[PDB]
From a paper:
The ATP-dependent chromatin remodeler SRCAP complex (SRCAP-C) promotes the replacement of canonical histone H2A–H2B dimer with H2A.Z–H2B dimer. Here, we determined structures of human SRCAP-C bound to H2A-containing nucleosome at near-atomic resolution. SRCAP-C can be divided into motor and ARP modules, which merge at the ATPase of the SRCAP subunit. As a scaffold, the SRCAP subunit consists of an N-terminal helicase-SANT-associated (HSA) and pre-HSA helices that integrate the ARP module, an ATPase domain grasping the nucleosomal DNA, and an insert threading through the RUVBL1–RUVBL2 hexamer.
ADP-BeFx is a structural analog of the pre-ATP hydrolysis nucleotide, where BeFx mimics γ-phosphoryl group in the ground state. Cryo-EM map of the complex in the ADP-BeFx-bound state reveals a compact fold with approximate dimensions of ~170 Å × 170 Å × 200 Å. The cryo-EM map in the ADP-BeFx-bound conformation shows that ADP, but not ADP-BeFx, is present in RUVBL1 and RUVBL2, consistent with the remaining low ATPase activity of the ATPase-dead mutant of SRCAP-C. The ATPase in the ADP-BeFx-bound state adopts a fold similar to those in previously reported structures of yeast SWR-C and Snf2. Two lobes of the ATPase together grasp nucleosomal DNA at SHL 2. At interface-3, we observed cryo-EM density packing against the acidic patch of the motor-proximal H2A–H2B dimer. The density is in close proximity to the modeled N-terminus (residue V18) of ZNHIT1, suggesting that the density is derived from the N-terminal region of ZNHIT1 (residues 1–17). Consistently, this region is rich in positively charged residues (K4/K5/R9/R16/R17), possibly generating charge–charge interactions with the acidic patch of H2A–H2B. In the ADP-BeFx-bound state, the C-terminal tail of histone H2A (residues 110–119) interacts with the αN helix of H3, and the C-terminal basic residues are positioned near the entry DNA. The contacts between the basic residues of the N-terminal region of ZNHIT1 and the H2A–H2B acidic patch in the ADP-BeFx-bound state suggest a key role of these residues in H2A-H2A.Z exchange.
Author numbering:
A (entry chain J): 130 to 156
B (entry chain C): 41 to 135
C (entry chain L): 1 to 41
D (entry chain W): 18 to 114
E (entry chain A): 12 to 119
F (entry chain B): 27 to 122
G (entry chain I): 725 to 772
H (entry chain D): 22 to 102
DNA sequence: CTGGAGAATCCCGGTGCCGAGGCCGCTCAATTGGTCGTAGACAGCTCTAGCACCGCTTAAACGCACGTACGCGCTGTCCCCCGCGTTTTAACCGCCAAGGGGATTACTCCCTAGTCTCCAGGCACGTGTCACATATATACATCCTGT
C-alpha cells in the first residue's frame, strides 16, 4: 500500500533518519 | 449578603428543581452552528434538540460535581480551570 | 385453574427495605391524631 | 503561473443611539466586518482574522475565527482599524487592510 | 379450537412475553431462540421496572405529588444503592440531581 | 396510512397500578419507564447472546438468560431477578 | 553447585582448562537441571 | 451560523455549577466550561448526523441523538418513544 | 487440519509489506491476532445495530462504512473509508 | 480459482471474514461487498499498527516487533490511543514520562 | 486463609514506581490492598460465572478475558 | 559511607521500572490470593495456570493506571507526594466511585 | 561555579539458547456454477413538521460599583517517608514416582425448534373528556447580618 497517514509516513521517514544518525554515531 | 450566603441558597435551590438551566433559543443556535460543519441544510426535530440539551446539562452538571471535589482537594472553595482540566484528564477526555 | 395471584405479585419481598425508628414514631403519631381526629374517616 | 483572485468586502456599519450614553459616553454602536463578495465559505482558507482597534479599549487586538467575520462594539469617535487576515496555510503571507 | 392463552398469562407476567420473544426472534440476538429466554428476560425486565417504580413513587409521595415525574426517577435511581449502579451511566431526562452539598462548602 | 408505534406503556401501568393502587404515572415518566425496559431487555439479551456464542451455540436460552442476569444485575438485584424468573419458568412448564 | 545454577551465564562463556566436581555424587540425575547447567560448560578436561 | 458558543452566558454556567455542588466560581472557568461543552456537543452532533446521512434523511430525529449518546456511554431515558 | 484458526497468516503477510525485514514474536503476533478480533466484532456489532436502525435485514457495505465512520478518529476514519471503498470498487470490476 | 480476497489487491481474507460475518448473528444478509469492505478496513488497521510497532522496535535496535513496541506504537499515536483507549496490551508496560514536579533541579 | 498480604509493600511500591509515583504515604499500602481485592473479586466472580455456565471445573484464560471485557477493562494477549 | 539524597534513587526506580515491561507482583503470592478470592464463589474451582497470568496482567495494569491517576491528584494539591487523598480523588473522577 | 569521588548508565563486541520462520503434507473451507425467491430501491403521493416569519411582554442577561472572602506566597515547625544496612521468611530444587480429574471428541438418537399455515383476542390510535398541580396570594418561620 505505502499510502499511510501523512504523520505516519513522516514518522517512518523520521525513523529512517533516526536510525541513520544512530548508526552514524555507533559506526 | 455575606459572600457565599446567597450562593449556597442557590445551590440548595437548583439541586431541587428539574428544569433546564441553559436558555433554549441561545442553545439551539449553537446546536445548529455545530451541525453546520457536517451538512449544509440539516433539519432538527424539536425533541432532538431538547434531547441534546438534556445530554449536555447532565454532562456539565456531572463535570461540575467532579470538578468541585478537585477544588476541595487543594483546600479551595473556588473551582479553578485546572480543576476542570484535572477532572477531565482523569476522565480520559484529553489525557 | 391457575393460582391466579402471580399476575399481581403485590409484595414480592426480595427488596423489602424495612421501615423503622423515626418511621415508627410517625405511625404512632398518625394513630394518635387519628384517634384524636373527627367525623371524616 | 497560478494566480487566484478572491473578491471580498470589508467595512463597518454604525447606528446612532440618539443620545450620549451616561455609562461610558459612547454615542454610536458599530460592527466592523470582512465578508466575501461571492456567496462562498471563507473558512475553507482563512484560519482567523485579527482586528486591531484604537488603544482606548481594554483590549485593542480582537480575533474572529468563522465567516462572515465581524465584531460588534460601541464608540464615540472615528479611528483606523487594522484587519490582518491569516490563511490556513502558514506559508502564505497574511493580508493587511 | 381451545381458548388461546397468552405467554405472559401462563407464566404470570405483565410484560409481553410474545412481544419480548418477538423482538428476539427477528432481532438476530442469536440464531434459534428456545422456549424460556423471552420469559426470563421479560420477568426480569418488569421486575426491575417494579423495583424502580417503587422507589420513584415513594420519593414522589415524599414530595406530596401523586404523579411520578422524571425527578421521582433521578432521585430514586440515585437514592438506591444498586439501582444507581445498574443505571450509573444513564441520565434520566428532566430528573435533576440530588442536593449533595459538600460539607466543606458550608457556613462555618 | 396509520404509522402505529409500539411501546410498553400498557404493562408498566398494570404493574404500577398493582404495586401502587393509588399512584398514577405521568406520560413523561412512562417514557422513561419504557426506555428503561428496552434498555435492560437489550442488555440481558445481548449478554445471553454472547454467553451462547462463547460456548459455540446457535441458540440463546433461558439458562443463558439466567447466567446473563447473574452477570448484569448487582448482587441483590440479581438474586431477586433470578428467583422471580426461575419461579416463573416452573409455573409455566407445569401447565398453569 | 547451588550458586552455580543461578549464576551460569557468566561461567559458560569461558574456556575452562579443567572442570572439577567434588563429591560428584550431587549429580546423580540426567534430568536434574544442574546436570544440564554443568554439561553446557566449555571445558577441555573434566574430573569427578 | 456564527459565534453561538457565546449563547452560554455567565449566569447560564453559574446555575449549572450551583446544581453540581459548586459554591464559588472563578473567572476563567466560564471559558473552560464553554470549551468542554463545545467539544462534547460537536462529538454528539457529529455521531448523530452519521445516522442521518447514512439514512438519506435531511432532518436529525431524536433516535439519532439517543443512539449517538449511547455510543458515548450516555444512555438517555425520555426520548425512546 | 483446522482446530484453531487465526489471523497469523495475514498479520504476517501485511507486516512483510510495511517492513520487509521486520519479524514478529509469537506473543506480539498473538496480540495482533487478538486485536483484529476486537475491531471485527466492534465494527460488525455497530453495523448490525445500524442495519437495525434503518430497519434493514442485511448488513451491506454501506452499513459497514457507516460503522467505520462511528469509530475511527477522523484521519483514521478518513483513510479506512478510502481503503474499504477502493477495495469494494476494485472487487466489483472483477 | 481466485480467492475473493485477491480480487481486491489485498493481503487479508475476504472469504473467512464473510463467514465470520454471516455466522455471528449480526444481521440476516451479508452483502457481496460487506466482507470485502470489512476485510479491507481490518487490513488497513493492521498495516498502520504493524508499521508503527515494527520500526518502533527497530528504533530499539531490534529486527523483531516485540509487544513492548506494540504498546509504544499504539500509545504514541493520537488516533490509535483513542481507538484502543480501554485496551491493555499484555507485557507492554507503560510509556516513559516523568512529571516535572517530581523531577529535580 | 487471608493471603491478601502477598501483595506486599515492596510490590505496591514497584507498581507505584512504574506508575510514575515518586513518593508514597505510609497508609497507601493498606489502601491499595483494599482497592486491589475489590477489583480482583469482581473479575474473578465474573470469570467463575462464565465457568459454571460452560459446565467446566477449571477457570480458563478465556473466562478471565470475557469477564474482563465485561468490566470494560480490555486486555490483549491471552486469546482475546 | 555514601548515601543518595531523598529523591535520587526514587527517580532511578521510576526510570528502571517505567522502561521494562514485566510483572511486579510476586507470582506465587498473587496466585494464592486468587484462590482465596475464588474460594468464596465456587468451592473447588481449578484455575488454569494461564488464567492466573491473565488475572495478574489485568490487575497490574489496573493498579499502574490507578497510580498514574493518583499521582495527578497528589500534584493537584501542590504535593509531590501521593497519599490516600490523591488515589481517592482520581478514582472519584474516573467514575470508579 | 569549578573540584573530586563515587556510583550509575551506556554502547561495543562475544557467546549460546530457542523462538521465529522454513517447508511438507493433508483437512476445511472458501470458490465455482446455477435456480429461486425475494431486499430494497426507486417512482410517486399523502400530509406533518420544520422552518420563518412578526408582535408584545418582561425576564434576564449584563455592566458597574464596593467590600469581603478567599487565593498564591512565606516561613517555621516537626515528623514520617527514603536510603540503606542487617535479620528473616519465602521459595526454589532433587528426591520421589505417577494416578486421576477433567477438558476434548463422537456416535447415536429423541426432543425441541423452525416453518408455515389459519383464527381471534388485545394493542394501538383515536376520541371524550377530568382533573393534578402550576401559578398566585399571604402570613408564618426561619435565617440572616449590622449593631
Amino acid at each position: 500500500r505505502k499510502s499511510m497517514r501523512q504523520s505516519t509516513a513522516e514518522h517512518t521517514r523520521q525513523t529512517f533518519l533516526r536510525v541513520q544518525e544512530r548508526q552514524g554515531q555507533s559506526r | 449578603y455575606r459572600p457565599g450566603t446567597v450562593a449556597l441558597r442557590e445551590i440548595r435551590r437548583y439541586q431541587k428543581s428539574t428544569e433546564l438551566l441553559i436558555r433554549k433559543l441561545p442553545f439551539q443556535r449553537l446546536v445548529r452552528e455545530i451541525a453546520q460543519d457536517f451538512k449544509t441544510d440539516l433539519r432538527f426535530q424539536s425533541s432532538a434538540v431538547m434531547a441534546l440539551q438534556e445530554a449536555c446539562e447532565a454532562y456539565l452538571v456531572g463535570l461540575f460535581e467532579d470538578t468541585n471535589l478537585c477544588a476541595i482537594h487543594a483546600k479551595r472553595v473556588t473551582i479553578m480551570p485546572k480543576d476542570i482540566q484535572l477532572a477531565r484528564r482523569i476522565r480520559g477526555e484529553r489525557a | 385453574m391457575v393460582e391466579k395471584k402471580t399476575s399481581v405479585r403485590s409484595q414480592d419481598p426480595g427488596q423489602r427495605r424495612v421501615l423503622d425508628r423515626a418511621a415508627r414514631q410517625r405511625r404512632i403519631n398518625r394513630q394518635l391524631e387519628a384517634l384524636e381526629n373527627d367525623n371524616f374517616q | 503561473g497560478v494566480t487566484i483572485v478572491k473578491p471580498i468586502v470589508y467595512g463597518n456599519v454604525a447606528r446612532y443611539f440618539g443620545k450620549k450614553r451616561e455609562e461610558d459616553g459612547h454615542t454610536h454602536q458599530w460592527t466592523v466586518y470582512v465578508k466575501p463578495y461571492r456567496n462562498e465559505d471563507m473558512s475553507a482558507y482563512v484560519k482567523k482574522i485579527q482586528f486591531k482597534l484604537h488603544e482606548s479599549y481594554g483590549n485593542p487586538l480582537r480575533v474572529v475565527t468563522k465567516p462572515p467575520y465581524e465584531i460588534t462594539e460601541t464608540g464615540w469617535g472615528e479611528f483606523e482599524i487594522i484587519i490582518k487576515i491569516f490563511f490556513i496555510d502558514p506559508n502564505e503571507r497574511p493580508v493587511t487592510l | 379450537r381451545a381458548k388461546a392463552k397468552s405467554r405472559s398469562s401462563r407464566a404470570g407476567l405483565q410484560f409481553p412475553v410474545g412481544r419480548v420473544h418477538r423482538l428476539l426472534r427477528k432481532g438476530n440476538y442469536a440464531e434459534r431462540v428456545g422456549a424460556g429466554a423471552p420469559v426470563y428476560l421479560a420477568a426480569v425486565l418488569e421486575y426491575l421496572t417494579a423495583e424502580i417504580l417503587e422507589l420513584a413513587g415513594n420519593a414522589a409521595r415524599d414530595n406530596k405529588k401523586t404523579r411520578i415525574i422524571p425527578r421521582h426517577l433521578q432521585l430514586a435511581i440515585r437514592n438506591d444503592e444498586e439501582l444507581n449502579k445498574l443505571l450509573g451511566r444513564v441520565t434520566i431526562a428532566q430528573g435533576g440531581v440530588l442536593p449533595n452539598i459538600q460539607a466543606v462548602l458550608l457556613p462555618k | 396510512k396509520r404509522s402505529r408505534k409500539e411501546s410498553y406503556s400498557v404493562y408498566v401501568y398494570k404493574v404500577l397500578k398493582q404495586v401502587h393502587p393509588d399512584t398514577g404515572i405521568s406520560s413523561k415518566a412512562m417514557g422513561i419507564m419504557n426506555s428503561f425496559v428496552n434498555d435492560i431487555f437489550e442488555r440481558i439479551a445481548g449478554e445471553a447472546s454472547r454467553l451462547a456464542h462463547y460456548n459455540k451455540r446457535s441458540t440463546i436460552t433461558s439458562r443463558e438468560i439466567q447466567t446473563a442476569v447473574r452477570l448484569l444485575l448487582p448482587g441483590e438485584l440479581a438474586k431477586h431477578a433470578v428467583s422471580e424468573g426461575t419461579k416463573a419458568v416452573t409455573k409455566y412448564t407445569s401447565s398453569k | 553447585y547451588k550458586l552455580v545454577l543461578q549464576d551460569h551465564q557468566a561461567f559458560r562463556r569461558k574456556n575452562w582448562r579443567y572442570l572439577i566436581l567434588d563429591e560428584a555424587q550431587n549429580i546423580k540425575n540426567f534430568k536434574s537441571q544442574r546436570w544440564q547447567s554443568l554439561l553446557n560448560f566449555n571445558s577441555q578436561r573434566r574430573l569427578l | 451560523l456564527r459565534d453561538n458558543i457565546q449563547g452560554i452566558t455567565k449566569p447560564a454556567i453559574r446555575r449549572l455549577a450551583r446544581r453540581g455542588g459548586v459554591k464559588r466560581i472563578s473567572g476563567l472557568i466560564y471559558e473552560e466550561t464553554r470549551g468542554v461543552l463545545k467539544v462534547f456537543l460537536e462529538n454528539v452532533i457529529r455521531d448523530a448526523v452519521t445516522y442521518t446521512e447514512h439514512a438519506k434523511r435531511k432532518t436529525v430525529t431524536a433516535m439519532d441523538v439517543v443512539y449517538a449518546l449511547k455510543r458515548q456511554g450516555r444512555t438517555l431515558y425520555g426520548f425512546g418513544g
